[PDB]
Amino acid sequence: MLKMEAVPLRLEHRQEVIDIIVASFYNKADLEQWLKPGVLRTDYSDILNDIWNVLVERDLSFVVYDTNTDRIIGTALNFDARNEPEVDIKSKLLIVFEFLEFCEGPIRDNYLPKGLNQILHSFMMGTAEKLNPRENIACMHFMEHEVLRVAREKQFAGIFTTNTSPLTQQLADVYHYKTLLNFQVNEYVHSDGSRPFGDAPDEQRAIVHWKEV
Numbered sequence: 001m002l003k004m005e006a007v008p009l010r011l012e013h014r015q016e017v018i019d020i021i022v023a024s025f026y027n028k029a030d031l032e033q034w035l036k037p038g039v040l041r042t043d044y045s046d047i048l049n050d051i052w053n054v055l056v057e058r059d060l061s062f063v064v065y066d067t068n069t070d071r072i073i074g075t076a077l078n079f080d081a082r083n084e085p086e087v088d089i090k091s092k093l094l095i096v097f098e099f100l101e102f103c104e105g106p107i108r109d110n111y112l113p114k115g116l117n118q119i120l121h122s123f124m125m126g127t128a129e130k131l132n133p134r135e136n137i138a139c140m141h142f143m144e145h146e147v148l149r150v151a152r153e154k155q156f157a158g159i160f161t162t163n164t165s166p167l168t169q170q171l172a173d174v175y176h177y178k179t180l181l182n183f184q185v186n187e188y189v190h191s192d193g194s195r196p197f198g199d200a201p202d203e204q205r206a207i208v209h210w211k212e213v
């Protein structure tokens with residue numbers, strides 16, 4: 001059985017965290033696959049390097065160790081939704097972040113609690129590339145359980161996230177997250193009038209999820 005431990009993010013975790021996020025997203029991500037070509041691995045690592053110090057100092061994120069091997073197998077990166085660093089993105093990834101703000105913004109600022117230390121934003125979750133299905137599912141359940149623990153212990157009101165893959169969407173449902181928006185990603189229109197995910201099937205959703213703590 002996979003034995004795991006959640007450890008607060010440290011400064012020296014940067015390369016291990018970058019490796020997990022790059023592997024977990026690049027090519028794999030359900031939105032960026034429709035922005036091909038022009039998405040590079042460094043687009044993800046550039047964003048993470050730009051926020052790394054603030055990410056560690058806010059003390060809301062963690063890594064997951066396989067206690068048997070003492071190696072990092074997953075990571076959960078979190079911010080206060082109302083206290084997130086201002087990063088400017090060069091790549092086509094900016095379209096992804098603008099779409100997520102399209103989904104999250106109106107709901108966050110008009111229906112969720114006001115003030116700092118209220119909304120815990122689960123903004124990245126990833127697992128190591130070499131995990132088999134059993135280990136991936138176990139790690140996801142573990143991080144989902146620990147994000148809840150951080151939320152209560154840090155006195156947040158709830159957890160807020162947009163889930164863009166079928167597995168993360170279904171996990172959120174069985175963990176009793178409330179669905180606040182179920183958006184068809186091929187209907188999103190960019191500022192230039194194009195639909196950057198327009199080639200996606202009608203069944204690909206972006207789901208805004210909220211769980212009171």
Ligand SMILES: [Ca+2]
Pocket residue numbers: 001002134138
């Ligand atoms: Ca297991």
